[PDB]
Subunit: 299 residues, 4 copies
């Protein structure tokens, strides 16, 4: 496995991150997939309180039990509805304080490495949120703070308050892929200046960028993109890669990216996808990828 700094911090994450979003997958298949990720040298695990409604955190806690704590980077989330009523969601001191001990118990740990504000909450002043994170860092319950689906101006505001209060703000989680490049415009450049690295989701666009679908619904209902993806296969085999490994390597060519999240409940896919870590793609190949995909790419 290869490792990157998560923003300007002493924290190293694996370049491939395992995410266990949940649903009718048996527990036993979730557990053996996490085990496959460990066997592939994945250190860094992404989850959320809301995922399978607490089931995702509980299964990760069980699967990683026994792994020395220093070998794991545990990332989880707060912000999505996990209780009833208007205080059972969002980023208030109340919801965050009433969320963190549940996540620690289910993950079976003393501290969360990265704790991500899951969606910006316009009702919570960022002074309220960041002082709550300060209290949790002082208490040793979280080490580092992240954000997902935040306006760039709010990321900047949070990073500034964090620096003043000694709360490390080091992580942003965008949607990012060969097809979805919205974050290249403003998010990644801003994050890089602020000392924040990306941990990227939908990197395989839910299987569309594995080349598996011949002529999610957004691209599946388009035979043009599916045909253009099939034409990356020669480019991939040229580099001794699967289309999946090429799509994952492509994300990791961005120097603003710390890690690429993979989902999969197939042991063989996890091991194969993990081998994307460390792969340099030639300038020539990156120009030929943009040509093949053309106007199917979202900016």
């Amino acid at each position: 496995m290869e490792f990157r700094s998560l923003g300007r911090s002493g924290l190293s994450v694996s370049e491939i991150v395992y995410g266990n979003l949940l649903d009718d997958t048996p527990d036993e298949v979730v557990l053996s997939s996490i085990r496959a990720a460990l066997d592939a040298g994945v250190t860094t695990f992404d989850t959320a309180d809301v995922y399978g409604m607490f089931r995702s955190e509980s299964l990760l806690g069980r699967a990683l039990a026994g792994t020395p704590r220093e070998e794991l980077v545990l990332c989880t989330k707060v912000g999505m509805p996990t209780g009833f009523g208007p205080n059972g969601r969002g980023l208030s001191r109340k919801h965050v304080m009433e969320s963190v001990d549940g996540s620690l118990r289910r993950l079976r740990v003393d501290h969360i490495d990265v704790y991500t504000a899951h969606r910006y909450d316009p009702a919570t002043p960022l002074e309220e949120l960041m002082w709550t994170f300060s209290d949790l860092v002082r208490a040793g319950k979280i080490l580092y703070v992240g954000m997902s689906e935040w306006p760039v101006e709010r990321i900047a505001e949070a990073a500034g308050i964090g620096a003043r209060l000694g709360v490390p703000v080091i992580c942003h989680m965008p949607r990012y892929s060969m097809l979805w490049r919205a974050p290249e415009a403003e998010v990644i450049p801003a994050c890089r200046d602020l000392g924040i690295g990306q941990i990227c989701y939908f990197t395989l666009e839910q299987g569309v960028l594995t080349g598996k679908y011949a002529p999610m619904r957004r691209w599946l209902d388009d035979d043009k993109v599916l045909g253009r993806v099939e034409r990356l296969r020669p480019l991939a085999e040229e580099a001794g890669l699967t289309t999946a490994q090429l799509a994952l390597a492509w994300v990791l060519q961005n120097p603003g990216v710390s890690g690429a999240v993979i989902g999969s409940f197939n042991a063989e896919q996890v091991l194969a996808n993990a081998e994307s870590a460390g792969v340099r793609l030639e300038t020539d190949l990156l120009v030929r990828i943009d040509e093949v995909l053309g106007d199917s790419v979202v900016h």
Copy 2:
């Protein structure tokens, strides 16, 4: 139930708040009244250490036992005499530190949502008080701070120190009703600028604004006000409301108000009064209320 932001904060309170001030009401009637409040969708409960001398907090703790913590906003107080001698009252570091664990034990909770300085204490420097609140917020024993019966200049001073020390100052508890409008002059406008919402008491003026008394002693000894209140009954029925529901809706028309406190040991009154939540009153009706009440209104 309808919900408002408590000042500029991520905290939502129910627009109707249940207060259990105590006395010879049997425990069983207190408990069934709190239960009626829960059944009406009341999330937000007001009490104090001093109320029935600890009995109010103990009965609320018992009645709310089993309710998921995230569904409740628990408000309690410190400042009134609860022990013997000059350190058994007021807002000193000593009295606050020696008060908070008693309130947590009696309420059966890890944290108080809103902890209200009950009456301004001229002997305690506000730097002493606010650093004590900072220590309790750091420790996770209180989330948010409120005040009751404070001069406006002291509210402003506390809000400023709070912002610097990361202590949310979000709540003020005035006397406010169709008849008592003293807080409209300075308190509510100042509080709104400072990001503080009102949780209002004596909203029914101890039953005078239910229309129940035909021709507390302040208005009961005046047949003029009692006659003028009886004349709100047609205005109320016009709107499909009881006089009680009209009085409660009237308070909630103020955008500086987060919640209106109801007291009642009658299940039917609690359920009926709770239905005031969310009711818009027409401009026409608000002009006709001021006409009927005329000079009985205190400004």
Copy 3:
């Protein structure tokens, strides 16, 4: 009993403070003397780690066991040698951190009300000391900080750092009596500006100001002072006081004084001396005291 503010703080102390410095006094006589102080309405108790080498703190803890915590102001000290070697004394983070839990255990309490730096330590930077006090205030182990036998410039420096770090600096303990008035020149005026009240020791000058000695060694070896003290007896009886009660009232006439410490292992003396609390002395009597004592007074 009468009570004063301890400096600019919400803390009230009894005007008469019981000190239990120790030695061959049986435990049973120490315990019954503390009990006599409680019976006289004394709330405020002074001791030190070093006193009878931990025995003073242990006996006070035993005697006050069962008294509601809010009714007591416990004052103890750190700085004098209590262990072997150069880290077994002074005001270093190390010695203070290794001292406080011993004092809490022996006093049988969760927090010390007033914790006094016993003698200024030139080897400890005041930033080191005050940040250690900050950590103990945050932790809820001490409420308020005091000082004894400090240069005035160091009191000022400590008060400034305290205000910045949210550490209340409210108490100074000088030697002060009708005969010893050194603190009137600089200490009391400076302390009053800084919001610090005096808790005064040797107020009876070890029995010299009881009028008991007819014609400590400093004044005992002078028949002039002993004769002048005997001549305060008519002035005292004029005011319906013992010479002891007059000496204690005299200290309490200073508005910079919060409390006067009494030592005594005699129940009758404790009860009699406690009645000094609240006594106003006429301007006429204060001029006649200075005349009788004349040049025996130390300035």
Copy 4:
């Protein structure tokens, strides 16, 4: 034993410090050597998490068990690899937070006196490191911070952040001896201005400065230096010292030095070497040492 201030702090260290770096030395010989150090009046013990991989800390904890805590200054380290993967080393919040409880358990103590950043970590922002130390000082797990093998500009940066955050930065651990004087140029002068004292290692240059080797490999492969060391023997006996005692006294003549570390698993050497504490060397002898050693001295 003689004692010095560790930088500008209230902490006193013994002028001779015992270091137990580990290997096939039986436990019983390590334990009896630490015991010999205690018998010689050594209070101050240096170790590291990494030393004999946790064995050094465990053996020190066992040997010092029963010694009153106030009589000991325990120094340990973090930064060297103690776990697998890139988060099992360095100075990140993660590695420091996951290291400190292990060191406390193995040393059998509530707090480490001096906790030394073992080698500067270019991947960890010093704001991240110093806020982690702040959290540990607030929590009472460490008292004072030190550094080893740091660039002088980073020492200065850390000392500045420490002063702002109330983290005492008082200790630097250089290689320093009669032969190795690199730290005289910049490190010691800078440290003295910043209020940091030296605790020095390789003071006997691994036995080369005992005079024991007649005509480590750096000097052992040079018969010139070994011959020049043998010629310090008359100078040493002139002063009633062994060559070992002269080498240790020489380091302690520097006023920027708080302590000199000795390693030895020989009880007789420990007791003899400890007697170097407090020895003044004449100006004449210090000029004759520089003459004998000449150009073998590294600046």
